[PDB]
Write a protein that binds this ligand. Structure first.
Ligand SMILES: [Mg+2]
Ligand SMILES: [Mg+2]
Ligand SMILES: [Mg+2]
Lengths: 48, 48, 196, 202, 154, 140, 54, 145, 96
RNA sequence: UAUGCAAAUAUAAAAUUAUAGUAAUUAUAAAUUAUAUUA
C-alpha cells in the first residue's frame, strides 16, 4: 500500500477533529494553509 | 507454391490504413501549413 | 494568499544558506528598492534597477533600436529637405513655398509616426522583460574571458599537434624582414614552438 | 497625401492568405458587383452617398434626426410594390446593418434565442455549436453586464460623479428591496451599479 | 570583480523543478497520511487511485531537446514532408480549396475539399497518372463541381 | 481570485488536454481546482499534476487520429473550466466565474506569443514579475 | 589566390579593381523590399513605419 | 460473425498495453475492471475512425449470397458439385449471374518504369545513348580537352 | 557584436509582430469601409478619366522615387592627450 | 628577436607560513558604495 487511505471519518468537521486531538489548533498563525485543519497530533517545539 | 491459385482469385488484399488515418477529417487542419518554431532547450546548469 | 510566495512579511523569503548568514540580501538590492519591489528585482521603469537583462548584461540601448534618437537614427524625410535646400540655394528672384508646403506636410505626419514607434517600443520592453530577460541572473557572454573554455579547446589542439607539449605557446615573432636579412643556415621563418 | 516612404508590399506571413473570392484590387471605377455583401454594399454606398459612414444604425438615425425605421419602410413599400409592410422595414434594417454593424435590440436577442432553441441539440461531436450559442447568449445577460461593471470598477475606471450616482442609487433601496434583490445574489449589485454599467457598455 | 546583479537570488537552473513535481507530493503525502495522524486532503483522495504518468521527465534531468517529454504538450506534425508539399501545392493553386472547410474556425465534423482531393489524387497516381496531370485533373474536378453549384444558384 | 488565473492556464496553456467533456478528465480538473483554492497545492504543482494526469493508453497515437500538430479546440476547455467553478461554490454570484475566466483570455489574445509562457514566471516561484506584467492578471 | 595574383602582378596590393563590375553578383538589397531575415534593425522599423502610415 | 468483439489499428499495441498497465495502481477488482475496460473501449472497440469499407472481408455481401446459393443446406459433397457444375454453365447475360468487385492480386513491380529498370540489370548498358552513337554528318576532329 | 546581434533578432522578431498587428488593423479598416474605398484612400486613380491624369500621377511618383544624393554623416576623429585609442570617435572611456 | 646553452603550470595531491624545528593559522566571488548624453 503506497498510498494508504488514512483517516476517513467526516462525523465532525476537519477543524473539530483538529481542535480536539491537537494542540496545533491553538496556534492558528503558526501553520500554513495546506496543513491547517489537517493535523491530529500534539507537537513538541525544540529551539536549537 | 506450384499450385494454390484456386484460392488466389477470391483472395483478399490488406486494407490501406495509413492513408485512411492520414486523410481522416482533423480538427487541427489549417488552409496553409506552418512548421512550428524552435522550442527552448536546456543549455546547462549556468544557462538554464 | 494576498501576495507572492517568494516574499514574506519582512522581505524576500530566504531559501539558500547564503541568505541566513547574509540577510542584507533579503531587504536591499540597491537604491531603487522598495518593499513591494523585493522578489521583483527589476524596479519599475525609468527607475534605478529597471533595466532588463539579456544573458546577464543589462539592456541600456532601446531607443537606439527603433532608431529614435541614435546617430544611426532613421530619418523620415530626406528628399523633401534636400529639394527645399536646393530651391533656397539656386536663386532669389523666385521663391518657392510649394516645397516648404510638401515638407511641412511631411513633418506633420512624422510626429504621430514617432509617437507610434515609441509606444510599440515600450510594448517591446514589456515583452522582452516577460519572455526573454533573465533578470540579471545568468553569466555575461560578452567579454572574451567568459569564453575562456572555448579558447582552451583551441590551445589544446595546437598542443596535440606538437606531441602534447607546449600549451599556450606561440611562434617567436621574427623581424619585419627576417627572411631576407638572414644568411644560409639560420631559420628564416618562425617555426612551431615545439620545433624551436 | 503620400507616405514618408514608398515601398513594395510587406511579405506574406506563413499561414496568411487573401480570403477566397475577395477581389483585392478593386477600384471605385470598377463595375458594381451583382450580389449583396458587406463589401459590395459598402463600395456601392461609397459611390452613392459619397463618404458618409456611420459606426452603427442608431448613428444613422441620429444623423437623420426623427426618422424611424418604419417611416422609411413606407418609402420602400411604395417603391417595390410586391413587398409586405414588414418586409419593407426589414429591407431598410438589413441594408443599414450591412453598411454598418448589426443593431443591438431586445427584439433581435429574442429572435436569436428563439432560433437557437428551435434548432435544439445538434449532431456536432461535443455539441459544439450549442456550446457556442450558449456561451454567446450569456454575454448579453443582465448578470454578465453587472460583472463587466464590477471588473471595470476594479480597474478604477470611474470618477467621483459615478460614485455619488452609485451612492444615491443605493440610498433608494429599503431593507425589503435588499432582501428581494439579494435573492438573485447578483441583481442588487445591478441596482447599485446600473447607471455605471450602462455607462461602460454604451 | 563585477557580476550580474541578481546572482545572489539566482535560481538553481538544474534543480529548481524537483520541489514542485507531482510524484514528490504523492510520495510525501503518501507517507504522511499513512501515519494515521493526518487528514488526507481531497486531491490525495483522488489521485490515490489515478496516479500520474510514469515516463514524463524534465529536460533538466535529461539533457535532450528532441525528447518529447509530455503526452499532452507535444507538437509534431502528423504530416510527412511529401504530404506537406502536396496539399501546400494544391492549396496555393486555388484559395477556394484551402479555405472551404475552415474559413473562420475549423469545422471539424465536415469533410474538407483539401482532403477529398488528396484522396482522389493518390487514386490517380496509383492508376498511373503523372504528377502534373493528376493535380490539374483533381482541380478540374473541384472547379466543375463548383460550376454546377453556382449554375443552380443562378 | 488567483484561481481564475490557474484555470486560464489549464484552458489555454495546454495543447491537447484530451476531451475535456469526459467525466474522467473533468474530475481531474475539478479536484485540482478545489485544491488550488484552499491553498492545499501550489499552482505549479497542480498544473504539472493536470498535464501529467492519466488519460488513455497510447495517447499520442490516438491523438494522430484527430490532431495534426497536436493542438485541440479550446471550447471544451473553457466550458469545463467554467462548469467546475460553478459546481464548486467558488463565487457568491454565479456569473462572475464565467465572466472572469472569459475576460482574462480575451485580453491576452492580443499579446505577442500569447499562449506560451516562460516556465519560471508562469507560476509561483522565488522571483516574480511586477503586478502589472503578471500574465492573466487583472492589472495588465 | 590573392597572394599569387599579387606576386605575379595580376592583382593590386591594395584596392579592388573590379569593385563596380562585381555589384551584380552581390545581393544588393533594396530598402523597398523586405527580407524577413535580416540583422538590419533599420529596415524592419522602416517597413513598420511605412505600413502604419498607410 | 461475432467471433470476437475487439479490433485495432494501432502500431506496436503491445508496448502501449505494457506502459498503460505500468501507470495503473491497485489490484481491487473494481480498479482492474475499469482499467481493462477503459483500455478496451479506447482502442479495441471501434467507436471512432472506422468504416465498413475499411475492414478486411472475404465474404463481402455478394459473396455471401453466392455461398448460400451454392453450399447452404446440401446433403452431400456430390450434390454440392453437381450444383456448382450447373452454376459454371450460366451465360454472362443471365439475371442470375451476378458480378462483384474482385480483389486484384498485386503485381510484383507495380509500374512499367520499374519493369524496365528491373529488366535492365540482366543487360549491358551501352556507353552511348541511341541517338548519339551514329557518327555526325560533319566531322569532329578530336582534340585534347 | 555577437551579443548585440542576439538582441537585434529579438527586437526584430517583435517588430514583425507589431507590423502584423498593423496589417491586421488595415484589414479591419477594409471591412469597415469596403475594399475599394480603402484603395481610394491609398491613392488609387479611380478618378482618372484619361491617360493624361495617369501620367500626372505617375510623374509625381517619378519625382518622388528619384533619389537626391544622401549626405551621410561621418563621426569626427577625437584627438586625446596621450592617445590611448586613436580610434576615438566619441568621448566615452574605453578598456584598452 | 629561435645554429652552442635552457626539462618544467595544464596539474596524482593529505590545514597556512617556513630550505622540511620559528609564528598559529591562511585563502576566498555573487549583500551594501549617486553622476559614463535613450523615445
Ligand atoms: Mg545598480
Ligand atoms: Mg576589482
Ligand atoms: Mg553588488
Amino acid at each position: 500500500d503506497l498510498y494508504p487511505e488514512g483517516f476517513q471519518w467526516k462525523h465532525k468537521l476537519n477543524t473539530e477533529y483538529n481542535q480536539w486531538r491537537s494542540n496545533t489548533w491553538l496556534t492558528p498563525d503558526l501553520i500554513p494553509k495546506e496543513h491547517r485543519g489537517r493535523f491530529l497530533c500534539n507537537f513538541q517545539l525544540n529551539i536549537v | 507454391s506450384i499450385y494454390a491459385h484456386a484460392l488466389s482469385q477470391f483472395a483478399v488484399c490488406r486494407q490501406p490504413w495509413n492513408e485512411y488515418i492520414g486523410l481522416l477529417t482533423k480538427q487541427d487542419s489549417t488552409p496553409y501549413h506552418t512548421e512550428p518554431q524552435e522550442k527552448p532547450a536546456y543549455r546547462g546548469r549556468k544557462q538554464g | 494568499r494576498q501576495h507572492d510566495s517568494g516574499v514574506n512579511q519582512y522581505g524576500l523569503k530566504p531559501t539558500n544558506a547564503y541568505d541566513y548568514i547574509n540577510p542584507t540580501n533579503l531587504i536591499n538590492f540597491g537604491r531603487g528598492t522598495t518593499f513591494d519591489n523585493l522578489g521583483v528585482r527589476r524596479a519599475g521603469r525609468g527607475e534605478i534597477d529597471s533595466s532588463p537583462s539579456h544573458s546577464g548584461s543589462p539592456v541600456f540601448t532601446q531607443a537606439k533600436l527603433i532608431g529614435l534618437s541614435g546617430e544611426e537614427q532613421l530619418t523620415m524625410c530626406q528628399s523633401e529637405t534636400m529639394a527645399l535646400r536646393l530651391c533656397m540655394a539656386k536663386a532669389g528672384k523666385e521663391t518657392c513655398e510649394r516645397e516648404s508646403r510638401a515638407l511641412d506636410s511631411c513633418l506633420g505626419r512624422v510626429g504621430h509616426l514617432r509617437r507610434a514607434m515609441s509606444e510599440a517600443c515600450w510594448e517591446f520592453n514589456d515583452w522582452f522583460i516577460q519572455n526573454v530577460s533573465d533578470n540579471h541572473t545568468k553569466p555575461f557572454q560578452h567579454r572574451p574571458h567568459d569564453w575562456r573554455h572555448f579558447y582552451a579547446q583551441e590551445k589544446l589542439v595546437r598542443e596535440r599537434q606538437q606531441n602534447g607539449h607546449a600549451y599556450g605557446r606561440r611562434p617567436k615573432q621574427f623581424s619585419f624582414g627576417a627572411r631576407y636579412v638572414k644568411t644560409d643556415g639560420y631559420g628564416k621563418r618562425p617555426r612551431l614552438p615545439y620545433n624551436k | 497625401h503620400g507616405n514618408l516612404f514608398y515601398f513594395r508590399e510587406y511579405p506574406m506571413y506563413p499561414g496568411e492568405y487573401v480570403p477566397a473570392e475577395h477581389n483585392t484590387l478593386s477600384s471605385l471605377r470598377d463595375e458594381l458587383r451583382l450580389d449583396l455583401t458587406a463589401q459590395s454594399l459598402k463600395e456601392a454606398w461609397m459611390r452613392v452617398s459619397g463618404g458618409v459612414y456611420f459606426q452603427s444604425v442608431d448613428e444613422y438615425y441620429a444623423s437623420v434626426d426623427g426618422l424611424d425605421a418604419e417611416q422609411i419602410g413606407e418609402v420602400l413599400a411604395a417603391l417595390f410594390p410586391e413587398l409586405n409592410c414588414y418586409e419593407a422595414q426589414a429591407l431598410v434594417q438589413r441594408t443599414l446593418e450591412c453598411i454598418s454593424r448589426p443593431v443591438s435590440a431586445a427584439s433581435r436577442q429574442l429572435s436569436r434565442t428563439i432560433t437557437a432553441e428551435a434548432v435544439g441539440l445538434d449532431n456536432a461531436p461535443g455539441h459544439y455549436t450549442n456550446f457556442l450559442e450558449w456561451m454567446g447568449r450569456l454575454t448579453e445577460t443582465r448578470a454578465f453586464k453587472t460583472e463587466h461593471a464590477l471588473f471595470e470598477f476594479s480597474r478604477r475606471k470611474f470618477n467621483r460623479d459615478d460614485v455619488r450616482v452609485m451612492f444615491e442609487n443605493y440610498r433608494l433601496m429599503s431593507k425589503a428591496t435588499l432582501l428581494a434583490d439579494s435573492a438573485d445574489s447578483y441583481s442588487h449589485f445591478y441596482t447599485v451599479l446600473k447607471d455605471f454599467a450602462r455607462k461602460v457598455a454604451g | 570583480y563585477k557580476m550580474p546583479k541578481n546572482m545572489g537570488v539566482a535560481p538553481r537552473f538544474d534543480t529548481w523543478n524537483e520541489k514542485y513535481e507531482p510524484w514528490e507530493h504523492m510520495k510525501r503525502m503518501g507517507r504522511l497520511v499513512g501515519t494515521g495522524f493526518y487528514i488526507p486532503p481531497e486531491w490525495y483522495n483522488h489521485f490515490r487511485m489515478f496516479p500520474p504518468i510514469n515516463h514524463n521527465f524534465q529536460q533538466e534531468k535529461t539533457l535532450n531537446p528532441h525528447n518529447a517529454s509530455e503526452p499532452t504538450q507535444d507538437d509534431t506534425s502528423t504530416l510527412s514532408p511529401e504530404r506537406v508539399a502536396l496539399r501546400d501545392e494544391l492549396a496555393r493553386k486555388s484559395r477556394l480549396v484551402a479555405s472551404e472547410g475552415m474559413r473562420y474556425y475549423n469545422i471539424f465534423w465536415v469533410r474538407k475539399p483539401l482532403d477529398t482531393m488528396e484522396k482522389e489524387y493518390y487514386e490517380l497516381k496509383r492508376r498511373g497518372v503523372d504528377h502534373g496531370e493528376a493535380i490539374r485533373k483533381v482541380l478540374q474536378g473541384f472547379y466543375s463541381g463548383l460550376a454546377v453549384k453556382k449554375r443552380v444558384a443562378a | 481570485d488567483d484561481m481564475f488565473i490557474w484555470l486560464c492556464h489549464t484552458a489555454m496553456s495546454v495543447l491537447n488536454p484530451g476531451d475535456m467533456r469526459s467525466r474522467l478528465i473533468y474530475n481531474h480538473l475539478r479536484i485540482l481546482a478545489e485544491s488550488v483554492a484552499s491553498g492545499e497545492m501550489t499552482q505549479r504543482t497542480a498544473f504539472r499534476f493536470f498535464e501529467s494526469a492519466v488519460r488513455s493508453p497510447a495517447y499520442r497515437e490516438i491523438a494522430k487520429r484527430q490532431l495534426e500538430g497536436g493542438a485541440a479546440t479550446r471550447l471544451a476547455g473553457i466550458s469545463a473550466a467554467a462548469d467546475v467553478m460553478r459546481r464548486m461554490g467558488l463565487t457568491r454570484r454565479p456569473m462572475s466565474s464565467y465572466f472572469e475566466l472569459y475576460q482574462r483570455i480575451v485580453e491576452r489574445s492580443e499579446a505577442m506569443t500569447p499562449w506560451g509562457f516562460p516556465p519560471l514566471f508562469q507560476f509561483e516561484e522565488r522571483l516574480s514579475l511586477e503586478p502589472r506584467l503578471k500574465f492573466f492578471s487583472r492589472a495588465s | 589566390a590573392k597572394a599569387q595574383a599579387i606576386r605575379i602582378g595580376l592583382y593590386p596590393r591594395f584596392g579592388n579593381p573590379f569593385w563596380f563590375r562585381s555589384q551584380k553578383f552581390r545581393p544588393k538589397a533594396y530598402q523597398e523590399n523586405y527580407d524577413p531575415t535580416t540583422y538590419s534593425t533599420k529596415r524592419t522599423v522602416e517597413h513598420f513605419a511605412y505600413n502604419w502610415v498607410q | 460473425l461475432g467471433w470476437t468483439d475487439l479490433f485495432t489499428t494501432i502500431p506496436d499495441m503491445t508496448y502501449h498495453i505494457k506502459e498503460w498497465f505500468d501507470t495503473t495502481e491497485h489490484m481491487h477488482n473494481d480498479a482492474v475492471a475499469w482499467q481493462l475496460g477503459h483500455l478496451l473501449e479506447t482502442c479495441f472497440k471501434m467507436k471512432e475512425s472506422h468504416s465498413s469499407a475499411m475492414e478486411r472481408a472475404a465474404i463481402t455481401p455478394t459473396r455471401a449470397r453466392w455461398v448460400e446459393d451454392a453450399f447452404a443446406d446440401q446433403p452431400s459433397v456430390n450434390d454440392i458439385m453437381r450444383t456448382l457444375t450447373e452454376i459454371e454453365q450460366l451465360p454472362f447475360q443471365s439475371t442470375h449471374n451476378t458480378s462483384d468487385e474482385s480483389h486484384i492480386t498485386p503485381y510484383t513491380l507495380g509500374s512499367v518504369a520499374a519493369g524496365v529498370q528491373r529488366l535492365g540489370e540482366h543487360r549491358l548498358r551501352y556507353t552511348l545513348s541511341p541517338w548519339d552513337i551514329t557518327p555526325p554528318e560533319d566531322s569532329v576532329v578530336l582534340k585534347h580537352t | 557584436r555577437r551579443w548585440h546581434r542576439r538582441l537585434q533578432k529579438s527586437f526584430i522578431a517583435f517588430m514583425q509582430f507589431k507590423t502584423m498587428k498593423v496589417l491586421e488593423d488595415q484589414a479591419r479598416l477594409v471591412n469597415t469601409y469596403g475594399q475599394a474605398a480603402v484603395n481610394a484612400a491609398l491613392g488609387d486613380p479611380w478618378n482618372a478619366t484619361d491617360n493624361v491624369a495617369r501620367e500626372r500621377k505617375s510623374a509625381a511618383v517619378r519625382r518622388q522615387v528619384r533619389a537626391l544624393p544622401m549626405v551621410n554623416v561621418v563621426p569626427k576623429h577625437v584627438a586625446t592627450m596621450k592617445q590611448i585609442h586613436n580610434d576615438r570617435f566619441n568621448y566615452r572611456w574605453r578598456v584598452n
